[PDB]
Write a protein that binds this ligand. Structure first.
Ligand code: ATP
Lengths: 104, 73, 61, 141, 131, 56, 116
């Protein structure tokens, strides 16, 4: 139950530090929170800095990445288990680097 | 123009013949030094650089006159 | 073999030995760089003595 | 400030002192960024580095008179970037050696600047080649 | 004569270009891939991505990832990739020896996976002297 | 034929040895390249500095 | 003059402080923008990753006897971790982050987890 405290970037004035579970990883992909705003995966948050009337501020982009479900054939060179065991550490590393980038 | 010999006071802010620029500053900063640099540069030219010293001690005027002599100005 | 064993050997030797020859040439220009300052800085003694000889002549006056 | 302005200076100074004044203005505005410039964009970085070299260009020794021709080439060297490769310290030594080498081995620059009193293209090219050869011999150190 | 190759990583996109062959090293296979290939989905892990561009056989070593490697538009979702000759030989060999120093440490089953990943860092590094 | 084949291989090795002699002597002479001007010029310059001091 | 001169010193120092903190503001803005640009750089990879993970979990209906990274069967020993920023004066950052940290580690010692 390796949950982390990364400070997500909500607003320029104050950004509240959220707590998210990391390592159990919820193998459907959805990385979930401290139980009450838990996030479905592929619904991503990408913050964008644009000026309002006049000041600096950050505005989120809740872009939803469309997914082509499968390739027409989708062969495997590996087994269905080994591919996930080699893939989920990659997504773990991606989420760790995102929790460093947004924290920074 | 009137070259002082200084890139600072000859590129940023000129001193032309006729314009009475002013060397203000804190004590011991180089006012007498910039004035001496101007009078010492003004050798190749033809100007008669009258240097009046008011209330400076005698020994500093001796140092400045012997500096002028050493540089030939 | 036929192309490269000559296309990388002989020209390399040529540029290598011409680099020693060019070093000898620029070294000869460094032997000239001796003269470039040396004949004048042997005089710079009498230069800084005789230039101030005129101020010492003003001192004689 | 000086109330006269560019109505006093010679045409060579009327050319090069403009860029010098503008670059010193930008460097003095950006002076606070110098200690905090951490991989900021290339425009700010190079402009601030040339300003850090420009103040060293400005500072000159005691009782050293720089006649008009030599300070002209000195300002040009400082403002158009032909000393950006050197660090902050070596600007002074490089410029003294460059002024010596130029005033002693390119007397045509003296003829042009002392005589025609403008920084025309032949003088600009002569100074460019002289500064380039002096940078080569200063890499040879 | 090639494919659209996109080797990605967390904070970068290492090498997006077109190459004749792709010899990515998975766990079960070092599957050579080349134009018009049928869509396979490899679990590419430690090993060299030897590719043969017609200029030369420039190698890049990737620490791990995945490759939805399909019909000339492949996306090798590499964890960590160092392209071409960006890796340095003598430091790589000293890094292999330091990986040996990390190999003999301690601790049961907790730290032996880090020991494995240090060994496999060395397997990533052997590409440098081979490059 | 064994002699002829190892003659081929050793001929490759010999052109490699010539390129290696080139690559080594390049380093040696290019080290000499700036060092000769440095030796002559700085030997003049520092000796000038000291002679100029004693003559001041 | 030791009365006016002290106030001239404070005026100069406060003006220099305003200049320095304005430089730090612009530097921090450029740093935020370059971190945002690094995130935008990293977004294609994560996009294709959250598409491929859905692809894999669509082929296999989470039918798996594998994946040590999904051993969800107890709450024995949580390992909470904090990513914190390394600068001085840091706004009100560090106190907030380690305050959430202290609250959650107290709530974890409630459960008896031996949080590392
Ligand atoms: N370019 C320079 N290099 C080294 N020292 C300098 C330079 N310019 C000025 N100085 C220093 O400035 C001092 C002299 O400056 P100056 O005589 O103007 O000071 P001052 O006390 O304001 O003069 P006064 O006594 O007339 O008020 C010298 O001690 C000298 O060391």
């Amino acid at each position: 139950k390796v949950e982390m405290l990364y400070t997500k970037f909500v607003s320029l004035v104050k950004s509240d530090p959220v707590i998210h579970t990391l390592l159990p990883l919820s193998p459907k992909g959805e990385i979930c929170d401290i139980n009450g705003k838990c996030v479905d995966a592929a619904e991503d948050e990408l913050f964008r800095l644009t000026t309002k009337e006049g000041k600096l501020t950050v505005e989120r982009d809740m872009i939803k990445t469309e997914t082509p479900a499968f390739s027409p054939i989708l062969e495997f060179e590996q087994d269905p288990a080994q591919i996930l065991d080699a893939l989920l550490p990659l997504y773990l590393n991606s989420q760790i680097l995102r929790a460093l980038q947004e924290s920074l | 123009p009137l070259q002082t010999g200084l890139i600072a006071i000859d590129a940023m802010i000129p001193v032309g013949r006729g314009q009475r620029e002013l060397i203000i500053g804190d004590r011991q900063t180089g006012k007498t030094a910039v004035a001496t640099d101007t009078i010492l540069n003004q050798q190749g030219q033809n100007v008669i650089c009258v240097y009046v010293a008011i209330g400076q001690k005698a020994s500093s005027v001796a140092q400045v006159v012997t500096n002028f002599q050493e540089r030939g100005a | 073999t036929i192309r490269n064993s000559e296309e990388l050997r002989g020209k390399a030797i040529e540029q290598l030995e011409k680099a020693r020859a060019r070093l000898k040439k620029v070294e000869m220009d460094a032997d000239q760089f001796r003269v470039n300052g040396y004949s004048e800085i042997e005089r710079e003694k009498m230069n800084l003595i005789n230039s101030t000889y005129k101020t010492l002549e003003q001192f004689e006056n | 400030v000086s109330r006269v302005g560019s109505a006093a200076q010679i045409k060579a100074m009327k050319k090069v002192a403009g860029k010098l004044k503008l670059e010193l203005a930008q460097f003095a505005e950006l002076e606070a960024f110098a200690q905090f410039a951490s991989d900021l964009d290339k425009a700010t970085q190079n402009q601030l580095a040339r300003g850090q070299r420009l103040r060293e260009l400005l500072k000159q020794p005691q009782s050293a008179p720089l006649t008009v021709e030599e300070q002209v080439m000195t300002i040009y060297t400082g403002t158009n970037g032909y000393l950006d490769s050197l660090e902050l310290d070596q600007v002074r030594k490089y410029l003294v050696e460059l002024r010596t080498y130029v005033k002693t081995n390119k007397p045509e620059f003296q003829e042009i600047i002392s005589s025609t009193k403008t920084f025309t293209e032949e003088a600009e090219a002569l100074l460019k080649e002289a500064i380039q050869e002096q940078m080569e011999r200063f890499l040879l150190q | 004569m090639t494919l659209n190759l996109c080797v990605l990583t967390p904070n970068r996109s290492i090498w997006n270009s077109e190459v004749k062959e792709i010899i990515l090293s998975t766990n079960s296979g070092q599957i050579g891939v080349l134009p018009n290939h049928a869509p396979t989905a490899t679990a590419v892990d430690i090993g060299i991505l030897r590719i043969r561009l017609n200029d030369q056989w420039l190698t890049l070593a990737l620490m791990g990832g995945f490759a939805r490697i399909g019909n000339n538009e492949i996306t090798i979702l590499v964890n960590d990739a160092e392209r071409g000759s960006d890796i340095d030989p003598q430091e790589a060999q000293q890094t292999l020896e330091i990986a040996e120093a990390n190999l003999r440490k301690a601790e049961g089953k907790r730290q032996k996976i880090e020991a494995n990943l240090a060994l496999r860092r060395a397997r990533t590094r052997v590409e440098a002297s081979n490059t | 034929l064994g002699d002829f084949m190892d003659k081929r291989d050793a001929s490759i090795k010999e052109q490699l040895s010539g390129v290696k002699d080139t690559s080594s002597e390049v380093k040696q002479l290019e080290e000499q390249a700036n060092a000769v001007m440095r030796a002559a010029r700085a030997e003049i310059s520092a000796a000038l500095n000291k002679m100029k001091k004693e003559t001041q | 003059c030791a009365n006016l001169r002290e106030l001239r010193d404070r005026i100069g120092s406060v003006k220099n402080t305003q200049k320095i903190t304005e430089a730090m503001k612009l530097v921090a803005a450029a740093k935020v923008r370059r971190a945002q640009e690094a995130v935008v750089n990293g977004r294609p990879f994560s996009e294709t990753l959250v598409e491929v993970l859905y692809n894999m979990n669509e082929q296999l209906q989470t039918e798996d006897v594998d994946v040590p990274l999904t051993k969800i069967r107890t709450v024995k020993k949580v390992a909470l971790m904090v990513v914190t920023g390394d600068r001085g004066l840091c706004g009100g950052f560090n106190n907030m982050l380690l305050k959430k940290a202290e609250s959650r580690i107290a709530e974890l010692k409630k459960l008896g987890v031996d949080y590392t």
